[PDB]
Structure formats: structure tokens, C-alpha cells
Amino acid sequence: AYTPQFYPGATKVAENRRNHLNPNYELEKLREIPDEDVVKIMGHRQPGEDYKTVHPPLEEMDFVEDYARDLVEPLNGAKEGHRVRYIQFADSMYFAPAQPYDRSRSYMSRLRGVDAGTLSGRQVVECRESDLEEFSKNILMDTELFDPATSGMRGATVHGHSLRLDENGMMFDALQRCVFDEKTGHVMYVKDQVGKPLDAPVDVGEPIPEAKLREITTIYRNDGVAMRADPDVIEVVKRIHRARTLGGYIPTNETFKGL
């Protein structure tokens, strides 16, 4: 077969990107947030009530016979017929454990039937509500992919990915969804991801120490690991650029001899 590498490079940032891309790598979990708490922060449905449906279950609806369409096993949320919801994250440029394009690549490499979108200060993944909650609790929130200080589950107003951290090391938030409790040293979500307040704040753990952030981050920085310290990634990027240029000029084996 083919044993897949996942990313070029020898630095810690490249290794962390490879770990995020690897579906067989078990992400280290750093907190325990109950499923109902994740649902409450998500703010789409009330925990304990049934999922709303967009269409009848796939068994009830009638489809034409399609051999190729029936080869793919559908998600359970699709099998029942649940509405497609989203979960959005903002990542700080100051050593956040996960970054937008890294998040999107890991999502499309690890999860089934997801819709990932990448912005400079935003990253959103859309899926059927039940499966979305499942992998939001299992992977997105409980593992090293999330830091309650440098990253934040937030829709609506996203801003602060490029700003400096506040006095507690937390990313700037214009809505203040999460606050720092100095008595216990934990971050508490006082609002859900869109901005409506929660009746009971939910403890999402304490901020990851900066020393661990330096080791688990996936961003290149002059103060941290710089791309100049990882010439292998730059060479691969330049190779991709040259291959694109040669293919767009004349796509033959002779023009690719100058690769």
C-alpha cells in the first residue's frame, strides 16, 4: 500500500501539523467538558430535547436506484434527517494550538461529511447536528486542539486573532463570551458562541501554560519556531509553485524536466 506522510519539515510546528493531519494520532486530552455543556455553549438546541429534522429519515423518503450513490455509508445524522449546524473557532496568532488552515485540513482529513471554511481570523465547520456535537466534544473541545485562553468558540463578532493578549493571556473578545476566574484560575463561558448569555457559566478548564503552547502550536513565529529554521517547508512550497507555473505554461513531460 502507501504509508502516508502528512507534512514536510523537521521543526516542532511541522510535527504538530503532521499530528493534527494524522487520523491515527490520538490527540492528548487536557480537559473534560460534559456533552451537555458543549451543547449549551454551542447554543443551537436545548440539551435533553430531540434533534429537529430537515427531511424524513432516509428510509422513509424514496430515491431512484443509484449504485454509485449507495456505495457510501451515510452519517447517522443524515440517516435520521437532522439540520446542518456549525461550530466556529477563533485562533490567536500568539501560539494558539490550532490555526485556521491547519484546522480545516485536519477536519477534512479526520471527519466524515463536514464542510470546513477558512478565514484569516475565523474557521467554521458545518455538519449534521448530532455528529457535529459528537466530534465537537470528542476532538474539538477536550483535546489539545483547544486552549480556552488563546482560542475561543465564537460566532457573530470575531476579532482579535492578530491583537495582543490581555492581562490574563486571553485572546481579545468584543463580546466577552469567556472570562477568567482568578479565584479558581479557570476560564468560564458566560455566553454561548453567538452571544446570548448562559443561565449557568460552564467551566472549560484553565489556560494552557505558555511553555506547553510553544510546544503544541502550529504557527510559525520569529519569537517561536521561524520558517527560516524549517527550510524543508519552504522548498516544498516553492516546488508546488514551480509545478503550478510549469503546468499552466505548457503541461508536457518536457516542460516539467525543468522542475
Binding site: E49, S130, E134, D199
Partner: peptide, 25 residues
Amino acid sequence: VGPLYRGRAKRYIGMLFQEYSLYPH
């Protein structure tokens, strides 16, 4: 809404909905 308010009593309130659901995963 708020912990100074409805969230005070909501900690001791449990409701089993008519259209209940569990986590099938």
C-alpha cells in the same frame, strides 16, 4: 437570564421532554 437569577433555581430543575433524546454515539 443570569446566574444571579433563573440560573439559581435552574440548577435544581430537571425536565424530561416529550420529544426526548439521548446521545446515540
